[PDB]
Design an enzyme around this catalytic site. Structure first.
Site, PDB file in Angstrom:
ATOM      1  N   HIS A  78      23.064 -55.798  90.777  1.00  0.00           N
ATOM      2  CA  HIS A  78      24.416 -56.314  91.048  1.00  0.00           C
ATOM      3  C   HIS A  78      24.678 -56.687  92.505  1.00  0.00           C
ATOM      4  CE1 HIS A  78      25.065 -54.536  87.002  1.00  0.00           C
ATOM      5  NE2 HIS A  78      25.811 -55.618  86.865  1.00  0.00           N
ATOM      6  N   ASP A 119      31.783 -59.196  90.545  1.00  0.00           N
ATOM      7  CA  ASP A 119      31.111 -57.892  90.729  1.00  0.00           C
ATOM      8  C   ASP A 119      31.251 -57.346  92.161  1.00  0.00           C
ATOM      9  OD1 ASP A 119      30.135 -57.033  88.197  1.00  0.00           O
ATOM     10  OD2 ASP A 119      28.434 -58.398  88.315  1.00  0.00           O
TER      11      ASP A 119
HETATM   12  C1  LIG Z   1      29.737 -58.581  78.031  1.00  0.00           C
HETATM   13  C2  LIG Z   1      28.582 -59.291  78.686  1.00  0.00           C
HETATM   14  C3  LIG Z   1      27.757 -58.405  79.569  1.00  0.00           C
HETATM   15  C4  LIG Z   1      27.914 -58.422  80.947  1.00  0.00           C
HETATM   16  C5  LIG Z   1      27.112 -57.600  81.719  1.00  0.00           C
HETATM   17  C6  LIG Z   1      26.187 -56.779  81.113  1.00  0.00           C
HETATM   18  C7  LIG Z   1      25.341 -55.923  81.875  1.00  0.00           C
HETATM   19  C8  LIG Z   1      23.987 -55.983  82.138  1.00  0.00           C
HETATM   20  C9  LIG Z   1      22.957 -56.938  81.795  1.00  0.00           C
HETATM   21  N1  LIG Z   1      23.067 -58.152  82.323  1.00  0.00           N
HETATM   22  N2  LIG Z   1      21.944 -58.786  81.947  1.00  0.00           N
HETATM   23  C10 LIG Z   1      21.746 -60.153  82.412  1.00  0.00           C
HETATM   24  C11 LIG Z   1      21.098 -57.984  81.225  1.00  0.00           C
HETATM   25  N3  LIG Z   1      19.904 -58.326  80.758  1.00  0.00           N
HETATM   26  C12 LIG Z   1      19.360 -57.305  80.090  1.00  0.00           C
HETATM   27  N4  LIG Z   1      19.855 -56.082  79.846  1.00  0.00           N
HETATM   28  C13 LIG Z   1      21.069 -55.763  80.336  1.00  0.00           C
HETATM   29  N5  LIG Z   1      21.608 -54.465  80.104  1.00  0.00           N
HETATM   30  C14 LIG Z   1      20.735 -53.636  79.260  1.00  0.00           C
HETATM   31  C15 LIG Z   1      21.666 -52.702  78.490  1.00  0.00           C
HETATM   32  C16 LIG Z   1      22.930 -53.511  78.352  1.00  0.00           C
HETATM   33  N6  LIG Z   1      24.120 -52.612  78.359  1.00  0.00           N
HETATM   34  C17 LIG Z   1      25.427 -53.341  78.389  1.00  0.00           C
HETATM   35  C18 LIG Z   1      24.109 -51.625  77.239  1.00  0.00           C
HETATM   36  C19 LIG Z   1      22.956 -54.488  79.527  1.00  0.00           C
HETATM   37  C20 LIG Z   1      21.731 -56.756  81.074  1.00  0.00           C
HETATM   38  C21 LIG Z   1      23.729 -54.874  82.975  1.00  0.00           C
HETATM   39  N7  LIG Z   1      24.839 -54.157  83.211  1.00  0.00           N
HETATM   40  N8  LIG Z   1      25.788 -54.803  82.524  1.00  0.00           N
HETATM   41  C22 LIG Z   1      27.139 -54.289  82.563  1.00  0.00           C
HETATM   42  C23 LIG Z   1      26.043 -56.766  79.752  1.00  0.00           C
HETATM   43  C24 LIG Z   1      26.826 -57.583  78.982  1.00  0.00           C
HETATM   44 MG   LIG Z   2      30.220 -56.694  86.226  1.00  0.00          MG
HETATM   45 ZN   LIG Z   3      27.954 -59.567  86.621  1.00  0.00          ZN
END
Ligand SMILES: CCc1ccc(-c2c(-c3nn(C)c4ncnc(N5CC[C@@H](N(C)C)C5)c34)cnn2C)cc1
Ligand SMILES: [Mg+2]
Ligand SMILES: [Zn+2]
EC number: 3.1.4.17
Length: 339
Positions: A78, A119
């Protein structure tokens, strides 16, 4: 600063000069050296005609860009590069998809600004860790939910009210306060809880079809597009996906370490002794990523390639699964690791 000097005196580079592929979905904004990205922000806004449309003062915008850029810390995922590549994907949407036939210009403008800010001041830890670890942000925000997101918004607001950074202070009180509303809604929409609440509504929207005169469609579409941007790293090729996992798990496991040192047990996926990466990634791709991009495709058929690319990245995880089992001996020919 010296970055501040160069942005303020050199001129706004036209977009083609950054890369002949810059407005294409196959472009990887993480290839851009971190040092060129404030410039690029400026070129994207220029190429969308926003600087002229809303009569934005150039120095104020330069200063605002730099403040936004340095309001990001440096966790492995982030960080400012995440925020830049999310804003860049918002740009592609406008270039490739012709949002103008679905959205007002002021809404498109707000989405893009929100992307840069969404963020701000992230520490590399999520909403439940804030509660679980009773921090000042949870203190401030925890009773209303979306702890981190309310903090992101609040930082955006604090930059806007810093002398010489208020790129909107010439809007009518009506437009100025619409702009703050839109950023608050859009940033708040980046919480996975929010998205899960509005999912049926989004499905309905795509089902009945988009209605330009329905204000609530405008709102919902804005939320879908923001989540599209925030997940856009999964729309490139396997090389980006793999590298994105490295950065994401490094961040999750770090938080997991801190949960263990405080005396809680972290969730599986945040625990480096239990987290099995291919399977977590495949779950994420199947349940969250793919449905968001299937919805995009439902409403703008020219977005279909985004969805197939996400599907295709989920396939690779499956294909490389087997490599996470040690067969044979480890490279150094020793069972030293086993001890
Ligand atoms: C609503 C849309 C949204 C926005 C941000 C996130 C996000 C991610 C993430 N971003 N991207 C590009 C990922 N590519 C792979 N895995 C990822 N993780 C693994 C586990 C999963 N988690 C939410 C259970 C997210 C992420 C990391 N932190 N957050 C909060 C997720 C969804
Ligand atoms: Mg965010
Ligand atoms: Zn983001």
């Amino acid at each position: 600063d010296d970055e501040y000097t160069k942005l303020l005196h050199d001129g706004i580079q036209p977009v083609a000069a950054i890369d002949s592929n810059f407005a294409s979905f196959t472009y990887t904004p993480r290839s851009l050296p971190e040092d060129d990205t404030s410039m690029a922000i400026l070129s994207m806004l220029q190429d969308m005609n926003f600087i002229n449309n809303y009569k934005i003062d150039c120095p104020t915008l330069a200063r605002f860009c730099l403040m936004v850029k340095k309001g990001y810390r440096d966790p492995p995922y982030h960080n400012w590069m995440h925020a830049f590549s999310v804003s860049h994907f918002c740009y592609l949407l406008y270039k490739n998809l012709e949002l103008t036939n679905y959205l007002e210009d002021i809404e498109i403008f707000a989405l893009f600004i929100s992307c840069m800010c969404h963020d701000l001041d992230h520490r590399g830890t999520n909403n439940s860790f804030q509660v679980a670890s009773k921090s000042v942000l949870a203190a401030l925000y925890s009773s209303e939910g979306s702890v981190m997101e309310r903090h992101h918004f609040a930082q955006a607001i604090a930059i806007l009210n810093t002398h010489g950074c208020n790129i909107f202070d010439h809007f009518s009180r009506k437009d100025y306060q619409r702009m703050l509303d839109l950023m608050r809604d859009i940033i708040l929409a980046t919480d996975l809880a929010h998205h899960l609440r509005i999912f049926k509504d989004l499905q309905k929207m795509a089902e009945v079809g988009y209605d330009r005169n329905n204000k609530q469609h405008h709102r919902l579409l804005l939320c879908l597009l923001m989540t599209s941007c925030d997940l856009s790293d999964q729309t490139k090729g396997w090389k980006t996906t793999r590298k994105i996992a490295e950065l994401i798990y490094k961040e999750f496991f770090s938080q997991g370490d801190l949960e263990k040192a405080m005396g809680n047990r972290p969730m599986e996926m945040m625990d480096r002794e239990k987290a099995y990466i291919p399977e977590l990634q495949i779950s994420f791709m199947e349940h969250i990523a793919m449905p968001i991009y299937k919805l995009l495709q439902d409403l703008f058929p020219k977005a279909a390639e985004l969805y197939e690319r996400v599907a295709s990245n989920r396939e690779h995880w499956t294909k490389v699964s087997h490599k996470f089992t040690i067969r044979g001996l480890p490279s150094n020919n020793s069972l030293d690791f086993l001890d």
